C-alpha cells in the first residue's frame, strides 16, 4: 500500500524499456497547476488512503523466513532450446532474391497511396524486405 | 530467443544501434564503425568494434574494412542504423 | 577476368604476419574471444554481456 500503490499488472510489464526522465522533465510534473495528475494519481492521498481502507479488516502476518544454506552446484552446458526447424536448401534460394537484381525492380512496382510521396512507397517496401533477412540470419545462427 | 539479447538493451541509454565515430589527428580524420546505444556519446563507450572506414586514402579509392561474421549476427538482435 | 570482368575463384592466399619471424607457441593461453559478448548462465543457456572491450585484448597473448 505505502511502498507501491495500486498499479495494474498489465501496465507494469509493458513499461520495461521506458527511459527515465531528466532533471528538467521532473520539474514539469511538480510545477503548478498539476494538470498531468490522473485518477487516483495523487502523491499525497494515495499513500495514506490505501492504508486506511485495509485497516477495518484483518492483516495477514508476514511469512516466516527460516535461514537455510544453499547446496553447491556445478556448471552444466545445455543445448539451445530455441532452434527453428528449417532446411538449409530453402534459405539458400531466398537469399538470392533480396540480394539479387530482382529486389531493385520489385520496389519500383508498388502501388501508391494518397497523401504519400513517391519515395515513401519504395521506403516502406524496402523496410518489409529488411524484416525477412533478419529472421533468415537468426535461424542460421541458431542452427550452427 | 529474445532472452539472449536482454543484456544488450539498456534502459538508461537506449536500444542498440550502429553508427560511426570521428577520431585520429586533426586534418587526417578517419571514421570508425562501432556498436553502441542511442544516447551514448559519439566518442565513448562501445560494445563491439565492427571495423573502420577511410573515405580519403593515398590511392584515391575509398577503403572499407568490415567483419562479415559480426554484422550479420548483430542485425538479428534488432539493431537499427542511419540512412 | 579480362573479357567478362568478374572475380575469379582461385586467387592468391592470405599473408599472415609474424613477429621476429618466429611463429611457434608452446604454451598458448585460454583466450576469451571464442564467445564474443556471450556467456553461460546458471541454467546452461547462452546469455550476453554489457562491458567495454579491452583495447589491448589481442596484444596480450
Amino acid at each position: 500500500a505505502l511502498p507501491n500503490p495500486s498499479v495494474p499488472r498489465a501496465a507494469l510489464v509493458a513499461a520495461r524499456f521506458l527511459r527515465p526522465p531528466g532533471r528538467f522533465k521532473r520539474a514539469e510534473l511538480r510545477e503548478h497547476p498539476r494538470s498531468k495528475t490522473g485518477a487516483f494519481a495523487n502523491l499525497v492521498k494515495t499513500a495514506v488512503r490505501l492504508r486506511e481502507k485495509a485497516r477495518a479488516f484483518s492483516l495477514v502476518p508476514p511469512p516466516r523466513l527460516i535461514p537455510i544454506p544453499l547446496p553447491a552446484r556445478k556448471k552444466h552446458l545445455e543445448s539451445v532450446r530455441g532452434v527453428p526447424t528449417v532446411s538449409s536448401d530453402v534459405l539458400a534460394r531466398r537469399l538470392h532474391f533480396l540480394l539479387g537484381p530482382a529486389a531493385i525492380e520489385q520496389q519500383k512496382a508498388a502501388k501508391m497511396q494518397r497523401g504519400l510521396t513517391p519515395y515513401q512507397t519504395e521506403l516502406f517496401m524496402w523496410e518489409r524486405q529488411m524484416r525477412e533477412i533478419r529472421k533468415i540470419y537468426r535461424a542460421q545462427y541458431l542452427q550452427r | 530467443v529474445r532472452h539472449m539479447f536482454l543484456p544488450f538493451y539498456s534502459k538508461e541509454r537506449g536500444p542498440p544501434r550502429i553508427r560511426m565515430q570521428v577520431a585520429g589527428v586533426k586534418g587526417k580524420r578517419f571514421y570508425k564503425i562501432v556498436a553502441a546505444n542511442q544516447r551514448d556519446p559519439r566518442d565513448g563507450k562501445h560494445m563491439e568494434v565492427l571495423g573502420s572506414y577511410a573515405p580519403c586514402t593515398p590511392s584515391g579509392v575509398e577503403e572499407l574494412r568490415l567483419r562479415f561474421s559480426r554484422i550479420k549476427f548483430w542485425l538479428a538482435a534488432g539493431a537499427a542504423f542511419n540512412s | 577476368y579480362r573479357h567478362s570482368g568478374k572475380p575469379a575463384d582461385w586467387q592468391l592466399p592470405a599473408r599472415p604476419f609474424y613477429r621476429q619471424g618466429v611463429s611457434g607457441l608452446l604454451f598458448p593461453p585460454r583466450l576469451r574471444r571464442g564467445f564474443p559478448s556471450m556467456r553461460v548462465n546458471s541454467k546452461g543457456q547462452f546469455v550476453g554481456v554489457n562491458k567495454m572491450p579491452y583495447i589491448a585484448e589481442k596484444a596480450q597473448p
Binding site: 537469399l95 538470392h96 | 562479415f68 | 572475380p7 575463384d9 592466399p13 592470405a14 599472415p16
Partner: peptide
C-alpha cells in the same frame, strides 16, 4: 558452383585460411 553472391565468396576465404593453420 559459381558463387555469385558477395557473402558466399567472402566466406570462401575464411575457410581456406583456417584449413592451412589446422594440423
Amino acid at each position: 558452383r559459381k558463387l555469385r553472391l558477395h557473402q558466399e565468396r567472402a566466406s570462401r576465404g575464411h575457410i581456406e585460411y583456417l584449413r592451412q593453420l589446422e594440423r
